[PDB]
Write an enzyme that holds these catalytic residues in place. Structure first.
Site, short mmCIF file in Angstrom:
data_model
loop_
_atom_site.label_atom_id
_atom_site.label_comp_id
_atom_site.label_asym_id
_atom_site.label_seq_id
_atom_site.Cartn_x
_atom_site.Cartn_y
_atom_site.Cartn_z
N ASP A 32 65.33 -129.81 -109.74
CA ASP A 32 64.51 -131.00 -109.95
C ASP A 32 64.47 -131.92 -108.72
OD1 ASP A 32 63.02 -133.05 -111.05
OD2 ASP A 32 64.74 -133.93 -112.11
N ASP A 215 57.59 -133.57 -107.35
CA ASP A 215 58.58 -133.49 -108.43
C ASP A 215 58.55 -132.13 -109.13
OD1 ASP A 215 60.25 -133.81 -110.59
OD2 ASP A 215 59.11 -135.46 -111.49
C1 ZYE Z 1 60.02 -128.97 -117.42
C2 ZYE Z 1 59.93 -129.64 -118.80
N1 ZYE Z 1 58.74 -130.52 -118.93
C3 ZYE Z 1 57.53 -130.22 -119.52
C4 ZYE Z 1 56.62 -131.31 -119.47
C5 ZYE Z 1 57.35 -132.31 -118.81
C6 ZYE Z 1 57.01 -133.72 -118.41
N2 ZYE Z 1 55.72 -134.30 -118.70
C7 ZYE Z 1 55.59 -135.38 -119.66
C8 ZYE Z 1 54.11 -135.68 -119.67
C9 ZYE Z 1 53.44 -134.71 -118.67
C10 ZYE Z 1 54.57 -133.87 -118.10
O1 ZYE Z 1 54.49 -132.95 -117.25
C11 ZYE Z 1 58.00 -134.53 -117.73
C12 ZYE Z 1 59.30 -134.01 -117.42
C13 ZYE Z 1 60.31 -134.83 -116.73
O2 ZYE Z 1 60.52 -136.00 -117.15
N3 ZYE Z 1 61.08 -134.17 -115.82
C14 ZYE Z 1 62.32 -134.72 -115.21
C15 ZYE Z 1 63.35 -133.56 -115.23
C16 ZYE Z 1 63.41 -132.95 -116.63
C17 ZYE Z 1 63.39 -131.47 -116.65
C18 ZYE Z 1 63.43 -130.72 -117.92
C19 ZYE Z 1 63.48 -131.45 -119.21
C20 ZYE Z 1 63.50 -132.94 -119.23
C21 ZYE Z 1 63.47 -133.70 -117.96
C22 ZYE Z 1 62.18 -135.31 -113.77
O3 ZYE Z 1 63.41 -135.80 -113.24
C23 ZYE Z 1 61.17 -136.46 -113.74
N4 ZYE Z 1 60.97 -137.09 -112.42
C24 ZYE Z 1 60.52 -138.53 -112.23
C25 ZYE Z 1 61.38 -139.48 -113.06
C26 ZYE Z 1 60.79 -140.19 -114.17
C27 ZYE Z 1 61.59 -141.08 -114.97
C28 ZYE Z 1 62.97 -141.29 -114.66
C29 ZYE Z 1 63.60 -140.59 -113.54
O4 ZYE Z 1 64.96 -140.74 -113.17
C30 ZYE Z 1 65.54 -140.04 -112.06
C31 ZYE Z 1 62.77 -139.69 -112.75
C32 ZYE Z 1 59.62 -132.63 -117.81
C33 ZYE Z 1 58.65 -131.84 -118.48
#
Ligand code: ZYE
Length: 372
Positions: A32, A215
């Site tokens: 990630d 990301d």
């Molecule tokens: C791979 C699984 N998956 C599928 C969809 C989908 C999705 N979404 C939601 C709407 C559209 C979309 O694509 C969002 C995320 C997501 O939130 N990914 C996380 C990692 C993660 C991986 C696996 C499971 C849970 C979290 C990442 O750090 C975000 N970066 C910025 C970020 C945002 C907020 C806080 C922060 O703190 C470091 C970082 C995962 C998603």
């Protein structure tokens, strides 16, 4: 030996094999670039095939501090500690690293995904609880002779994470670099967006409200509301020969066609122009519909090919997620504070159109496109 060291399921992230503890416990860890905490399941969960058992590791050290991390999707809480970590199909080194042992979670682990933890590859500035919790890659560089750089080729799915270098066999053509604007997320600047060649005609700060990031842990291309609405309007116009329910454009409903008959040609190419390393210069990456219409595998619907629209709205800036990165070789050049893009060996294209990374382009508008 690092080629093809990533696996995954479409829409569910890409993971690399790691070991933690002494003796080594093998776990699959999602890669990630959108966060900075290294965390692993460390208690039983319905969706976990296995988890980190601290009691079995003689090298585990408890930091006596809890941590809570909420993402866009999912959240977990856990206990901070440190332990020895290795990557079997990566650099042959062992480092002591901070690890969050996840003891409680909500909508984080995914039914059937095959990974049990997450490796946040971004900077300490966004680590929780605060920036004094050194991220994994920082520990790796400080404790070994690995160069301060990694690259990702995201292509059941697979790919490569090359730690400490660039593998030329993984891309074709030229590598184009955009500056990392700020070292917290991998923040970049988008200067222009075109749909089938037509400019969205928007103040370029709008594209980066309130930041734009690269990301690997997010699936979709996520766009600021105003940019999202404008993009959907233009994609609708280009594809107007067929009419879809509003629910499809909101990512709440699948679109399906008889197997093998998906009308790729009616959907536009999307071009994102990224700030170059030289004043008022840019380059563009072009994304085909094969990228932003994500296949949803389901045997129940398998008489057809069905897709979800993988562009969605954001209130926290642009996120260039896995849908954008797939088919490109992306170099996270931390040492030189820049991100490189090139066409991947595992690229998208039909016989008419090909994803591309190309430049240079020049802009006459001297406005800084960064939001802050
Ligand atoms: C791979 C699984 N998956 C599928 C969809 C989908 C999705 N979404 C939601 C709407 C559209 C979309 O694509 C969002 C995320 C997501 O939130 N990914 C996380 C990692 C993660 C991986 C696996 C499971 C849970 C979290 C990442 O750090 C975000 N970066 C910025 C970020 C945002 C907020 C806080 C922060 O703190 C470091 C970082 C995962 C998603």
């Amino acid at each position: 030996e690092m080629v093809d060291n990533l696996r995954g399921k479409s829409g569910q992230g890409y993971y690399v094999e790691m070991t933690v503890g002494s003796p080594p416990q093998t776990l699959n860890i999602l890669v990630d670039t959108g966060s900075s905490n290294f965390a692993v399941g460390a208690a039983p969960h319905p969706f976990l095939h296995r988890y980190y058992q601290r009691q079995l590791s003689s090298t585990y050290r408890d930091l006596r501090k809890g941590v809570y991390v909420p993402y866009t999707q999912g959240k977990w809480e856990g206990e901070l500690g440190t332990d020895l970590v290795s990557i079997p199909h990566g650099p042959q080194v062992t480092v002591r690293a901070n690890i969050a042992a996840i003891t409680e979670s909500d909508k984080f682990f995914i039914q059937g995904s095959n990974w049990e933890g997450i490796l946040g590859l971004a900077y300490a500035e966004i680590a929780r609880p605060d920036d004094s919790l050194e991220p994994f890659f920082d520990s790796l560089v400080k404790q070994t002779h690995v160069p301060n750089l990694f690259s990702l080729q995201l292509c059941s799915v697979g790919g490569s994470m090359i730690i400490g270098g660039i593998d030329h066999s993984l891309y074709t053509g030229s590598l184009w670099y955009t500056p990392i604007r700020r070292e917290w997320y991998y923040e970049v600047i988008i200067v222009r967006v075109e749909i089938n060649g037509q400019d969205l005609k928007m103040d370029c700060k709008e594209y980066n409200y309130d930041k734009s990031i690269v990301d690997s842990g997010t699936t979709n291309l996520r766009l600021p509301k105003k940019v999202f609405e404008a993009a959907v309007k233009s994609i609708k116009a280009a594809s107007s020969t067929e009419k879809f329910p509003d629910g499809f454009w909101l990512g709440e409903q699948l679109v399906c066609w008889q197997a093998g008959t998906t009308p790729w040609n009616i959907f536009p190419v999307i071009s994102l122009y990224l700030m170059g390393e030289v004043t008022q210069q840019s380059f563009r990456i072009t994304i085909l519909p094969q990228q932003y219409l994500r296949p949803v595998e389901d045997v129940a619907t398998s008489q057809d090919d069905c897709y979800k629209f993988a562009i969605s709205q954001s209130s926290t800036g642009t996120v260039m997620g896995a849908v954008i990165m797939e088919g490109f070789y992306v170099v996270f050049d931390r040492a030189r504070k820049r991100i490189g893009f090139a066409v991947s060996a595992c690229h998208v294209h039909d016989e008419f159109r090909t994803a591309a990374v190309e430049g240079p382009f020049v802009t006459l508008d001297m406005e800084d496109c960064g939001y802050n």
